[PDB]
From a paper:
Computational design of KE07 involved construction of a theozyme to catalyze the chemical reaction, which was then grafted into the scaffold of imidazole glycerol phosphate synthase (HisF) from Thermotoga maritima. Catalytically essential residues from the initial design include a base (Glu101) that facilitates C−H bond cleavage, an H-bond donor (Lys222) to stabilize the phenoxide intermediate, and a π-stacking residue (Trp50), which was designed to stabilize the transition state and favor substrate binding through interactions with the aromatic ring of the substrate.
Trp50 in the active site of KE07 is a convenient spectroscopic handle to interrogate the active site environment (a second tryptophan residue, Trp156, is invariant throughout evolution). A Trp50Ala mutation was made in KE07 R1 to assess the contribution of Trp50 to the fluorescence; the crystal structures showed no major changes to the active site nor overall fold. The Trp50Ala mutants in R1 and R7-2 result in significant (>95%) reductions in kcat, although the KM of R7-2_Trp50Ala increased sevenfold, whereas the KM of R1_Trp50Ala was unchanged, suggesting more involvement of Trp50 in substrate binding in the evolved configuration C.
Numbering used by the authors: 2 to 250
Write the structure that this text describes.
Amino acid sequence: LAKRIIAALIVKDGRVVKGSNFENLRDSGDPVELGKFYSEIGIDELSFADITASVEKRKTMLELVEKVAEQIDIPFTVGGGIHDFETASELILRGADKVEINTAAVENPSLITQIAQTFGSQAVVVYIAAKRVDGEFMVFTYSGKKNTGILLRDWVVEVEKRGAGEIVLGSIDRLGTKSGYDTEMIRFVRPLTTLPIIAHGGAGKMEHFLEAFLAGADAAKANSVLHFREIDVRELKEYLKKHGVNVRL
């Protein structure tokens, strides 16, 4: 019933893509050092998205979750190119608390159930990339390239039915725009599912977070606005608690 602030880091070959602005770390491109720092200053969870050349990807993603699990204590999700049960399983066993799946889940919905039966719904996070097309919310796969023809409304329902723990709701429209979260999309989805909704795409200033939590989101995923300190984590939670948002310290 508390809201969460989730720091999201894109990584490739064990490196924070386009790094960060905290000069106070020996390495501002070290995902591990950044992520532990974010944990100290009050990030509620981490989320790593790997985009490594698929040849060294599997080894590289397991290297990362191991390195991370050694140094941090808050939940963290790992995602990106996870296509089957065994890849998710070894990533969780190696340290990750949850995995984030999207395209594999749309093509094979039972993949949500298979991961959940062994690691529990809490470990399965489904990323839903939606966009408005002819007045309807549509689900997109392959990093935005494929309109699946599936309605957001139906996918959200099926994703809970299959046993997902949480849903990351990405507004494609708003991705990388600093214009605010797609609160219209969030309000559309909110009554369709009992699951936690993690809002992604559009953050630019602290009030967007208030707007998003007012819309019904249980958490907020945030990317470059964090790393380039266009928003401070402490000021944000200050702000939201001040205006009645139930955040943790």
